[PDB]
Amino acid sequence: PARAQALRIEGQVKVKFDVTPDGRVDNVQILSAKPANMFEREVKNAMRRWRYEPGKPGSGIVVNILFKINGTTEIQ
């Protein structure tokens, strides 16, 4: 078998928008509550926790990460 590396972030986000009479959203803006880079910082953070074997280092290592985000509105 082969060992993967994993990510699990929990988060929040605030969005303002208009609702039209047809019943469709428009004119969305995010209210960014964290410093502009929000998604990015939470990722780099989760890679602190990543472990490798000592005495075999390197640089420029690359990886692609497939992720699933799963939102849902809060506290009516």
Added chain:
Amino acid sequence: PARAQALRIEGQVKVKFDVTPDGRVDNVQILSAKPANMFEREVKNAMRRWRYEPGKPGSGIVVNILFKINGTTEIQ
């Protein structure tokens, strides 16, 4: 009961970093493959799909969205 609104994004992301001899990651940068705003565009996108009842519109509506991101490295 009360009706929520939901989000489900699937995505990818590329990251370059160093691995030290202690066995810890350092010097992380994202390789941003989509236009800088990646997380943001995928969100605004998912709110296209949101439905409201016609003939009751408004503007400046705000909502907070709690989300769970769940990564894991690809194709060894």
